[PDB]
């Protein structure tokens, strides 16, 4: 259903609203903010129960990473339309899922430039766009972030200069204390990463996050056999200071903060053909559910 094609941002929002109409006692669809160009950045809250641990999942902060919102939508479909098959992650866990963080870039990638990455807000002439995953206010503007407005990793004019990242900030801040698992979906590379993105040194509680990441990689290995490399983002992939996972872990005090690089496909890596969507999201959901189950089992 949601894994047969790449949905446009408007179609994604209508799907969320339809689920709100169809499952009002299970889900609530809320607007977390407005993009720079005026698009509604929506989230869906699944199984809201008082005192529950909260899993916050976002995707599509980078425009060209189409498989990340597709995986997030597939996770929504499994949890909402097939809740009877996912009771283990629907008892003490509450899900807040933001399928698209950067709708302006995402729509731009569909219409104008397939491999656009940043947002679409002008940066002060001659270039548009800010790297959303370099725009969070924790070690902002440091190694792995560029001061040049035209670079792929432009940190932005200031920290949280983009309304898209402010929407993520406000949604996670509203769940401070209750949010125990922050998951940010990216593509590509087959990685499950955690802080830090500003140094190669590991956080004090890196083992706890590593165990959650190991569970996701192990479940995928048992299910499909695909390999996911686990480690800190700086050590495994590259330095990425200003990322959302670092900010959620350190500022929002989310104990388990993970960035996931979903499988690549096509000639550019970011563009698997629509026929490949179903297999990729199915495999990715196996890992995502396993990490959430590991989080739920902590209590």
């Amino acid at each position: 259903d949601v894994s047969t094609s790449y949905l446009r941002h408007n179609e994604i929002n209508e799907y969320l609203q339809t689920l709100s109409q169809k499952y009002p006692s299970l889900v609530s669809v809320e607007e977390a903010g407005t993009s720079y160009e005026g698009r509604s950045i929506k989230t869906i809250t699944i199984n809201k129960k008082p005192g529950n641990a909260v899993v916050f999942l976002d995707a599509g902060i980078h425009a060209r990473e189409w498989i990340a919102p597709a995986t997030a939508l597939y996770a929504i479909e499994q949890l909402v339309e097939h809740s009877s098959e996912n009771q283990e992650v629907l008892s003490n866990l509450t899900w807040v899922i933001m399928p698209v963080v950067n709708p302006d870039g995402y729509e731009f990638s569909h219409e104008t430039d397939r491999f656009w990455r940043k947002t679409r807000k002008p940066t002060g002439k001659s270039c548009k766009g800010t790297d959303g995953n370099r725009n969070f206010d924790y070690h902002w503007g440091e190694v792995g972030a560029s001061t040049q407005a035209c670079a792929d990793t432009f940190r932005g004019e200031t920290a949280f200069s983009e309304p898209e990242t402010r929407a993520v900030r406000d949604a996670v801040m509203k769940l401070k204390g209750s949010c125990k698992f922050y998951l940010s979906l990216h593509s590509y590379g087959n990685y499950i990463l955690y802080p830090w993105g500003w140094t190669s040194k590991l956080p004090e509680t890196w083992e706890a996050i590593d165990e959650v990441a190991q569970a996701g990689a192990e479940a995928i290995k048992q299910s499909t056999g695909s390999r996911y490399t686990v480690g800190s983002s700086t050590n495994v992939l590259y330095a990425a200071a200003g990322g959302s996972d670092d900010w959620a872990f350190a500022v929002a005090e989310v104990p388990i903060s993970i960035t996931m690089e979903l499988p690549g496909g096509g000639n550019g890596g970011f563009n698997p053909p629509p026929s490949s969507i179903e297999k990729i999201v199915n495999e990715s959901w196996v890992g995502i559910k396993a990490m959430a189950l590991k989080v739920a089992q902590m209590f």
Binding site: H62, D152, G189, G231, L237, Y238, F270
Partner: protein, 35 residues
Amino acid sequence: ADPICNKPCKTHDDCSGAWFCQACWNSARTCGPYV
């Protein structure tokens, strides 16, 4: 269209002049795009 893609690298400078695969992936040790 980017010949620097999948070029072996130790640091980001080995991926200079790439325009798409500007990042040196640490585990892969090859030039790739920002993901």
